[PDB]
């Protein structure tokens, strides 16, 4: 009654979320990749004779030998831990991926590192909470994946509710401490870490030699 008044709204939409494509995937992704690419079959592709298992006998050490399919293997063994650590995911895959370019492995070896580093996390983080009972501040055992304080990590690293899948804390904690333990896990995590380290060091040798000795010329990118 007072004027025109019907609804005053902009025409305009100003914000435009665009898709912001995450530098560093969380570890719930990260994960969950490692899992993705044991999941992934690759019959589209011929492989014949990928030495990748050769390239890194020579870059990787000896110890290197049938690298793709200790990595698959490795990555079965996640798949196995994953499959119960994440809500309808199944413990045998039907894709199951079969080999591993040099250009995969890249990412494979940054990515196995990171998995042994959130779990050695993930192992610490359980054990103060196991370790946590009934508390003053009115803080119930932690008993479950989705308690309060477990949920609290796993919701800062990534894992979205619908994405853990709800086990015991105590069991939890037997089966990544015995994982983070693993002889196999070990073995060929501190020898990726060798080889990462090894190419960090050997890429900031090549920032340095293309800043002093080289000369950036005219390029892009490559496809």
């Known amino acids: ?23 560093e995937a969380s570890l719930k992704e990260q994960i969950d990749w490692l899992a993705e690419r044991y999941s992934a079959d690759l019959t589209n592709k011929d492989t014949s004779k990928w030495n990748t298992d050769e390239k890194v006998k020579e870059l990787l050490n000896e110890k290197a030998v049938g690298i793709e399919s200790r990595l698959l293997a490795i990555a079965k063994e996640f798949h196995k831990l994953k499959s119960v650590l994440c809500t309808g995911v199944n413990e045998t895959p039907a894709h199951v991926a079969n080999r591993v370019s040099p250009g ?46 477990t949920n609290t990590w796993f919701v800062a ?3 979205k509710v619908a994405e853990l ?13 015995e994982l983070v333990s693993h002889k196999d896990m070990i073995y060929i995590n501190d020898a990726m870490k060798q080889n990462v380290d090894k190419w960090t060091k050997e890429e900031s040798e090549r920032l340095a030699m293309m800043a002093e000795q080289g000369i950036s010329g005219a390029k892009g990118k490559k496809d």
Do not use: P
């Open 1 to 23: 009654s007072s004027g025109i008044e019907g609804c005053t709204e902009d025409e305009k939409r100003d914000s435009v979320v665009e898709g912001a494509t995450s530098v």
């Open 157 to 159: 690293h990534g894992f």
């Open 104 to 149: 995969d492995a890249i990412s494979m070896l940054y990515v196995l590192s990171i998995t042994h580093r959130e779990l050695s996390s993930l192992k610490n983080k359980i054990d103060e909470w196991k370790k946590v009972k009934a508390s003053e501040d009115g803080t119930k055992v932690i008993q479950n994946i989705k308690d309060d304080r």
């Open 165 to 177: 899948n709800d086990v015991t804390l105590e069991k939890l904690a037997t089966v990544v401490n």
